[PDB]
Design a binder for this molecule. Sequence first.
Ligand SMILES: [Mg+2]
Ligand SMILES: [Mg+2]
Ligand SMILES: [Mg+2]
Ligand SMILES: [Mg+2]
Length: 210
Amino acid sequence: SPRIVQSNDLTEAAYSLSRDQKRMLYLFVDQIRKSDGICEIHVAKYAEIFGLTSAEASKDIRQALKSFAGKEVVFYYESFPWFIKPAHSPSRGLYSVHINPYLIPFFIGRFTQFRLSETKEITNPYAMRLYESLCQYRKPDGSGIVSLKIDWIIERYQLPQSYQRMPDFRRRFLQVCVNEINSRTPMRLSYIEKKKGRQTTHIVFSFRDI
DNA sequence: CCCGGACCTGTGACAAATTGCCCTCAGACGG
DNA sequence: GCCGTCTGAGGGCAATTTGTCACAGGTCCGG
Ligand SMILES: [Mg+2]
Ligand SMILES: [Mg+2]
Ligand SMILES: [Mg+2]
Ligand SMILES: [Mg+2]
């Protein structure tokens, strides 16, 4: 199945994208890498890849696409827009898109890689971003260990402000996303909290392959 | 000493957003 | 050439999940 590879600069960039937008983003990165920035998406191809109907596929592409306008990317800093022209459909069931050509070197570079089947069942976009960043530290054999700082998680993934209250961080982001990964990917994930005084400062993740 | 106050935790409520579903009807094609 | 079928572009839904905040209940500080 398709092998995603991506620069670590993208794995650790600051942005806010939905699940549907990240799914499309994987195919753009795949298309670009297999080579001006103009990519293409076929409704019927998207539907088969993610086990959707043609109807529900069309709805996902259309709304994702019009929601890209105004979206930006920050590499730690420098900010860029994803698109430099609105999307448009030349043919029925087919969409044409214009990626910011200045993003090309950030896609292809110290790199991260995973098969697309590993992620196509994750629903929460924050849970996707976590699985990508763990992959960045994965070994050939399938294990790894990493400590991520809570302030850095909040900035890079752009979690909403009420998750600055730690019990909400635990309840609505950490537990759910560890649970999706353990239920929806071939990984098996555990964690422990590092504290300093009263504040929790980092989360230490350990994982292996099933 | 115990207070009021500034921290921290977890849970119950509700509001706002997203999920996979359902139905309608015109476009493109082929036989 | 007309029509039957597969597409996909629209319009909606209720059931779940995600985002937000009040309040109970712990500690330690300082005065
Ligand atoms: Mg959808
Ligand atoms: Mg009393
Ligand atoms: Mg009680
Ligand atoms: Mg009290």
